[PDB]
Amino acid sequence: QTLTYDDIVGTGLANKCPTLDDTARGAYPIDSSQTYRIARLCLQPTTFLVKEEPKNKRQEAEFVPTKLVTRETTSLDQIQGELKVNSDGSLTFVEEDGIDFQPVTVQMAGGERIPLLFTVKNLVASTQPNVTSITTSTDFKGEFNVPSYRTANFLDPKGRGLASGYDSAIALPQAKEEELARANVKRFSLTKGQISLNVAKVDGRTGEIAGTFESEQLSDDDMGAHEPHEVKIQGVFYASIEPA
Amino acid sequence: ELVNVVDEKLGTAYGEKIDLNNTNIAAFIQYRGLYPTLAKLIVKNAPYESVEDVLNIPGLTERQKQILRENLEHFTVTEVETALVEGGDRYNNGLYK
Amino acid sequence: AELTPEVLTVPLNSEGKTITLTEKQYLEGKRLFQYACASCHVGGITKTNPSLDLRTETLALATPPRDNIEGLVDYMKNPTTYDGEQEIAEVHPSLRSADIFPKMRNLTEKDLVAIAGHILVEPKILGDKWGGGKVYY
Amino acid sequence: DQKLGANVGSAQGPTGLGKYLMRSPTGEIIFGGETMRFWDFRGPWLEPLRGPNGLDLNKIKNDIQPWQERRAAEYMTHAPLGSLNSVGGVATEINSVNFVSPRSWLATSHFVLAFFFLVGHLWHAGRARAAAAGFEKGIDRESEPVLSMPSLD
Amino acid sequence: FGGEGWIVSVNNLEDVVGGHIWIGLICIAGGIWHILTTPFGWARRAFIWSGE
Amino acid sequence: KGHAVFRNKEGEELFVRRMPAFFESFPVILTDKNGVVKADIPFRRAESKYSFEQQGVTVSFYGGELNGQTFTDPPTVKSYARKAIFGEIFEFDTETLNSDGIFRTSPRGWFTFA
Amino acid sequence: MEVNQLGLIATALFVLVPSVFLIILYVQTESQ
Amino acid sequence: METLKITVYIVVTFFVLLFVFGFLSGDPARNPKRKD
Amino acid sequence: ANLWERFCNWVTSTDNRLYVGWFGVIMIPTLLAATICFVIAFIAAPPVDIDGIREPVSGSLLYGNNIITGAVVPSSNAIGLHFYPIWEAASLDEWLYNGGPYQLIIFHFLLGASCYMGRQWELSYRLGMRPWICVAYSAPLASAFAVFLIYPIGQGSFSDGMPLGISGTFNFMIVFQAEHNILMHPFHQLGVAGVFGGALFCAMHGSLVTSSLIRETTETESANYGYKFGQEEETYNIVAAHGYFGRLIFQYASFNNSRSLHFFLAAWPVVGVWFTALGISTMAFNLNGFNFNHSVIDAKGNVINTWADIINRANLGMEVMHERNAHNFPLDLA
Amino acid sequence: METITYVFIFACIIALFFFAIFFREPPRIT
Amino acid sequence: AIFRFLLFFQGFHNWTLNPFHMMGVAGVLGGALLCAIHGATVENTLFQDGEGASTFRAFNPTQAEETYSMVTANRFWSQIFGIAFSNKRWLHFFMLFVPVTGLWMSAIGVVGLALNLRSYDFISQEIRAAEDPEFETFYTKNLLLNEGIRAWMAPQDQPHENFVFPEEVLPRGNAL
Ligand code: CLA
Ligand code: CLA
Ligand SMILES: CC(C)=CCC/C(C)=C/CC/C(C)=C/CC/C(C)=C/CC/C(C)=C/CC/C(C)=C\CC/C(C)=C/CC/C(C)=C/CC/C(C)=C/CC1=CC(=O)C(C)=C(C)C1=O
Ligand SMILES: CCCCCCCCCCCCCCCC(=O)OC[C@H](CO[C@@H]1O[C@H](CS(=O)(=O)O)[C@@H](O)[C@H](O)[C@H]1O)OC(=O)CCCCCCCCCCCCCCC
Ligand code: HEC
Ligand SMILES: CC1=C(/C=C/C(C)=C/C=C/C(C)=C/C=C/C=C(C)/C=C/C=C(C)/C=C/C2=C(C)CCCC2(C)C)C(C)(C)CCC1
Ligand code: OEY
Ligand SMILES: [Cl-]
Ligand SMILES: [Cl-]
Ligand SMILES: [Fe+2]
């Protein structure tokens, strides 16, 4: 029903997306002449998988599970964008704005912590062609940008940075610099991720949809210091569509 | 093969002029009439392919187009540098006094 | 060095006329500036918007210009944005908004003038320190 | 910054955390930066922006009134930090503002008093016990308790 | 602890006035209690009975 | 390696300020013959005025192993400017002793201390 | 961590030698 | 996690009760001179 | 007697090698828990995001620290003052990342040391002693409460508690000076007088009694053998020690009442350390040390710097560097 | 090796505590 | 002036890291400890040598006898802390030794600093930190503070050097 902040505060529910009944299996008609918007998009991740970096034998890379260590801080919400109807009938969502990134740290077996910028920044996701309505078989697929996990002012523990900081290892005044260049020279990555959204619940009355998502993106590379990992994220999403 | 792209930018026109595609919004205080109103329009409206595209911004007044012309000599454009425009850094770049 | 009428002579208006303050008026505007302004503007910076300071050079490039008494007095009556486009009496203390900024309620025209002279005189004394922030402390 | 055109909801700060807004450990939306520690704060000027998940980006984008901006600026510039000779501000601030929060004065004075009253409790409690058993003036040389006790080793 | 705040968290005048009704009654009844009672044996054994 | 001479784009010769012995670390500041700051390696770059890129700082060597050479790319000029705070620039063998790059004192210092 | 390899021996002897000194003196005190 | 929580509540409770009851067990009389 | 009375008698037994007592019933389990957790954390604990900005600090020996740099790292700023027992974490790994051990340690420790103090009272009652040793211990105990509990409360976060380490202690000291000018605070000045003067009077008393030891031994033996445990006689000549010290200054600057002399020894350091604990506890609420920045100006209004202005320049460099990634807004208000 | 050395010395000190307390020379009233 | 000296020693010499100062800290705080605990112990093992509640009058400097009980003091500390003093001569010699030796040790460290012979760094930590941007400890955090102190205080503290530091070269974290 109506929940107040005071009802929710401290419970962990602020990190949860809204859900729809099991009887919300309707269809939302898409009026091609009309123009639409996602008034709220919520992505709540439930599992983080990291691809194993195998050995020199070119055997097999598997996605292994991980342990979240940064608590109920992972969900993207209040995301908005135009929902466009295209010529071929497909729908395209173009994100404008929202809380569209959370830094997350998971931990692998052995104790390696893997930070990542879980994000759908600049998301553009499209349906298959000729979609006269959104149904519990509707799929969006899209891609987003993954900016660097730290941004340009971030100083490392010896004071080095991109847009600020020392440009060298000042504690080793007369060391050969060439061995340290990768650490001394901060670099800002920008990469792409891919995401599937599978609508499995529709309240054709309200324009609410809900389902699951899977995304693949890269993890933090620490401003070029080491190579990132591949991450696969899975979870649930909720969105409400309003005529624009 | 490894370069600090912010240092490389200081060697371009970004280092001498207000770079409509990269410079932080506080730099528009340097010249009369630009801040806050026009600085906001400039930054908001994409990057620019040439300095003079700035006069084509929808909605300028005649007084505004005239201020922009007076200050074209203080503007440049260079390629957009991710590290300078990400994180909303064009609006707040961590620098105060 | 001492506080001399040369130091205490500041632009009255934009057209070039000047006016020479007394030591008494300077001290008085310093007190009043502490009373009414320093909470946000100590040493010529602006704590709640550090991009705008009270340096004469900055004041000069404001629209309208503010590197003179008349300009500053008018700013304390009807404040505007740096480019003159908006009135901001609602969030900046002024005589216009003495109802919501009570410390302005008692201020007289001779008071605002003293405050303006303090603002305009102080960078002649302190140089870079005025408006420079903590770098110059 | 929002007034200048920043999207304060999607602005990634240097650490990767939101520059203006982030989540608390239970997910509530809260102001970012070091103030993340103060997200439990509740006050009349701020609660209008609160929704069920914490701060609401639509209320932030649309419903902030001048009185809230005024209040926020007023309170920021009157944080309870100040010097013993009542120079308001952080320790590195120059003289100008003659201010110390009465919350500081009232908190510091009453901690000092409370602490000294715990000491007096210990003093007078210990003494009243010793007095009631009759050795508050010292040990009796002719019947020293320890002397009648077995050696520890 | 944080987010709870024991009694320091009271944030409305209804609860403030309310708890002072309880405390006033509690204190008045306690006053009568002690006027009419003498301490029980377990309490006599537990405390030191002196001015200091 | 040779005596390093620094010039800005205007051909004026600039002088690296030398590290005093108190300082474990020290910023790179070039001044003119009058001691007016003319170039530096900035910490915060967003509002730098004196960066080597902005000032067209070059280095040219006279004597030593680099005699008659001039370097113009800012990264190279910057590394030689960081050595110019130590005084004259020398080529070192760090491999043989597995040297770590951190200054030691001399027998004069050790005798005096003991 | 790239520590000093003579650190181990310096620490070991620093403990060992003075401690053995004291042990020698204590035991021969006890046996008289 | 729940099991840990309960086990610490019980342990803490047990020790706190000993403390209260011990001091209630006529502690003023436990001294070398006057048994009140 | 019955089983409860047997147990009570053992607990309060004056014949146990170590006194237990009712305070000891709480002291022992809490100090044990704190000690075990500390030792394991200092050796093995993984890195801790002290400042809540996903920038973990390594504190333990196995993660590349030594004795001097190692620490149990304070818990995350994201947690602030929230209680974070193991059972509130989703996993031990989460608990370790976020600095859980620091909470467990300091809470058990503060609780155990409070009971240590009460235990000092208790045994003094069973032995027939005067009771006020525990009051002397309250000076260091209060000091511990100030850096682990009071200062976090006023600043709103345990991530600004003192770290449990040697280098972390210095970090805490430096950041403090920058944000409170503690050196210019008179309560800290009283603490320095307390410990300097306590060291003085420590050496003074030792030297003066040592100087007036009565000849009871020969030159081939330690003079210490001139004192026999329990002996009724005194082993030095306080009159001689008064006569020496009275002349070294003047007669009335010197004590000849042993009781007065030794109360002075108790009171001086204890008081001073009370003030410096109160100094931390009140800077916790941001009543900082004197501020004379730009207090001297000349006839024109130029700033004439003093040594206070020089201190401020040092304070500013501490201010602008500490937690270099943790501030997004220009004032460091907590 | 350096971790082992720090921990060994710490361990030895804890051992010395035990002997210093429980196997002290007993003070006796002469 | 002395406070500036302290902070100078932190930023330039990293004096808190120096083991000779650490010994000196232990000797001074240890002296204060001994001062307080010996004075309190004596005041709370006094014998009743008078009938007044103010126990100071019950001492006569000519008296032969100990004014407090060494035997009860020893037992108290044995059972509280595990050991106690049992020899009053060792006790007061140790009170001389501790703070005197502490100050002597700190002197040696300062003689070192005359030559800038500092314990400023730990090489192994700098080699790792230089290579590993994710390695942070309280040691590296405090060096950044030292770097802040030096560049912000030097120009005014050593004016004869004519240090001129453009704002852009000043080490600063974000925002502040
Ligand atoms: C200034 C207030 C005050 C004081 C000093 C006293 C003092 C006394 N009362 Mg009275 N009393 C008061 C107010 C007061 N009372 C009021 C207002 C009421 C009405 C509720 C009562 C009701 C009352 C009763 C019914 C009895 C007493 C009794 C006593 C005696 C023993 C108290 C005792 O053992 O302590 C406390 C000791 C304990 C062992 C209590 C438990 C200790 C644990 C740790 C605390 C847990 C319980 C706590 C109350 C609730 C937790 C609150 C927490 C969340 C902060 C003592 C003379 C007793 C007596 O002898 O009567 C003649 C008795 O039986 N009083
Ligand atoms: C004297 C014994 C003692 C004391 C006082 C403490 C005290 C504490 N421990 Mg520690 N602990 C102890 C022994 C003790 N411990 C031992 C022996 C162990 C080893 C297993 C631990 C292991 C341990 C862990 C692993 C953790 C603590 C934590 C804590 C803190 C919170 C405790 C809490 O939430 O319970 C609150 C207190 C109560 C519930 C009792 C109140 C007393 C009233 C009068 C009775 C209440 C009845 C009770 C609710 C009913 C219980 C049964 C029911 C649940 C079925 C606190 C500082 C946590 C911590 O440090 O967080 C930072 C934590 O994570 N302790
Ligand atoms: C130039 C020419 C012509 C030269 C000729 C010289 C000439 C002959 C002149 C004549 C002399 C003359 C006129 C001199 C004038 C100049 C003069 C007065 C100089 C001033 C010099 C000066 C600055 C002196 C220093 C001041 C000073 C150190 C003294 C004041 C401070 C002071 C009293 C400190 C000590 C405080 C004190 C009470 C200590 C107690 C410590 C204590 C607890 C000790 C423990 C302890 C104490 C006991 O008590 C006993 C018992 C026992 C057991 C024990 O544990
Ligand atoms: C102008 C403004 C208004 C004025 C304000 C006035 C305020 C004054 C404050 C209150 C005065 C307190 C009285 C002293 C207490 C006292 O008498 O003790 C009782 C004893 C009895 O004295 C002893 O007296 C004995 C006789 S009897 O016991 O008094 O009866 C005698 O036997 C013995 O020889 C003799 O030594 O005194 C002492 O033995 C002498 C030492 C006194 C030390 C006092 C406290 C310690 C100082 C702490 C230092 C703090 C600094 C911390 C670090 C910086
Ligand atoms: C915080 C509540 C303030 C106090 C109190 C005062 N000022 Fe202010 N000032 C403040 C802000 C946030 C701004 C910028 C507003 C904008 O968006 O443009 C200002 C600006 C000024 C200026 C303009 C300076 C310029 O460089 O153009 C002046 C001249 C000025 N303020 C003066 C002033 C005076 C005299 C005050 C005391 C009566 C005063 N301000 C108080 C914030 C705050
Ligand atoms: C007003 C108000 C309110 C209310 C209040 C109330 C209702 C309260 C109550 C209170 C109470 C209800 C309290 C109680 C307390 C208690 C106590 C504090 C106790 C203590 C105890 C003790 C002290 C004991 C001790 C001991 C022991 C343990 C053992 C033996 C010995 C002895 C006895 C010593 C509120 C908050 C709502 C709000 C605001 C206002
Ligand atoms: O001093 Mn500076 O202030 Ca007290 O918080 Mn804000 O910064 Mn940070 O976390 Mn530890 O520290
Ligand atoms: Cl820090
Ligand atoms: Cl911040
Ligand atoms: Fe003694």
Secondary-structure topology with pairs:
The structure is cut from a larger assembly and holds eleven protein chains of ten kinds.
Chain A: H1 5-8, E1 28-29, E2 36-51, E3 63-65, E4 67-68, E5 76-85, E6 91-99, E7 101-107, E8 113-119, E9 121-127, E10 133-134, E11 139-147, H2 181-184, E12 190-203, E13 208-218, E14 230-243
Chain F: E1 3-7, E2 13-16, E3 29-31, E4 37-40, H1 52-55, E5 58-62, E6 70-71, H2 74-83, H3 107-113
Antiparallel strand pairs in F: 1-2, 1-5, 2-3, 3-4, 5-6
Chain G: H1 6-30
The complex binds chlorophyll A (2 copies), the ligand CC(C)=CCC/C(C)=C/CC/C(C)=C/CC/C(C)=C/CC/C(C)=C/CC/C(C)=C\CC/C(C)=C/CC/C(C)=C/CC/C(C)=C/CC1=CC(=O)C(C)=C(C)C1=O, the ligand CCCCCCCCCCCCCCCC(=O)OC[C@H](CO[C@@H]1O[C@H](CS(=O)(=O)O)[C@@H](O)[C@H](O)[C@H]1O)OC(=O)CCCCCCCCCCCCCCC, heme C (HEC), beta-carotene, CA-MN4-O6 cluster (OEY) and 2 more.
Q: Give the oligomer, counting copies of the same chain as homo and different chains as hetero.
A: part of a larger assembly
Q: Any idea of the CATH class of chain B? A: Mainly Alpha
| Number of domains as seen in the coordinates of chain A | 2
The CATH class of the largest domain in chain A is identified as Mainly Beta
| Tally of separate helices of chain B | 4
CATH topology of the largest domain in chain A: Porin
> What fraction of the residues of chain B are assigned to beta strands by DSSP?
under 5%
Structural class of chain B: mainly alpha
- C-alpha Rg of chain B (nearest Å): 13 Å
State the domain count of chain B: 1
**Shape designation of chain A:** elongated
Distance between the termini of chain B: 35 Å
PDB class: photosynthesis
Keywords: Photosynthesis, Membrane protein, Photosystem II
Entry title: RT XFEL structure of the two-flash state of Photosystem II (2F, S3-rich) at 2.09 Angstrom resolution
Chain A: Photosystem II manganese-stabilizing polypeptide
Tell me what you see in this structure.
- The structure is cut from a larger assembly and holds 11 protein chains of 10 kinds.
- Chain C is 36% helix and 4% strand.
- A two-stranded antiparallel sheet of chain C has the order 1-2.
- Chain C starts with 8 loop residues before the first strand and ends in an 11-residue tail after the last helix.
- In chain C, a hairpin with a 6-residue loop joins strand 1 and strand 2.
- Chain C has one domain: Cytochrome Bc1 Complex, Chain D, domain 2 (Orthogonal Bundle), CATH 1.10.760.
- Chain C is built from 5 helices and 2 strands; from the N terminus they run ββααααα.
- Chain F has 114 residues and is an alpha+beta fold.
- Chain F has one domain: Photosystem II CP47 reaction center protein (Roll).
- Chain F contains 3 helices and 6 strands.
- Chain F has a 6-stranded antiparallel sheet with strand order 4-3-2-1-5-6, with helices on one face.
- In chain F, a hairpin with a 7-residue loop joins strand 5 and strand 6.
- Chain F is globular, with a radius of gyration of 16 Å.
- Chain I has 10 helices and 3 strands.
- In chain I, helix 2 runs antiparallel to helix 4, helix 4 runs antiparallel to helix 5 and helix 7 packs antiparallel against helix 9.
- Chain I has a domain of 130 residues: Photosystem II protein D1-like (Photosynthetic Reaction Center, subunit M, domain 1).
- Chain I is globular.
- The interface between I and J is small, with 10 and 10 residues.
- The site of the ligand CC(C)=CCC/C(C)=C/CC/C(C)=C/CC/C(C)=C/CC/C(C)=C/CC/C(C)=C\CC/C(C)=C/CC/C(C)=C/CC/C(C)=C/CC1=CC(=O)C(C)=C(C)C1=O has 15 residues of chain I, from helix 7, helix 8 and helix 9.
- The site of one chloride ion has 3 residues of chain I, from loops.
- Chain E: Belongs to the PsbB/PsbC family. PsbC subfamily.
- Chain E: It is found in: Cellular thylakoid membrane.
- Chain E: This is Photosystem II CP43 reaction center protein.
- Chain H: InterPro entries: PSII_PsbI, PSII_PsbI_sf.
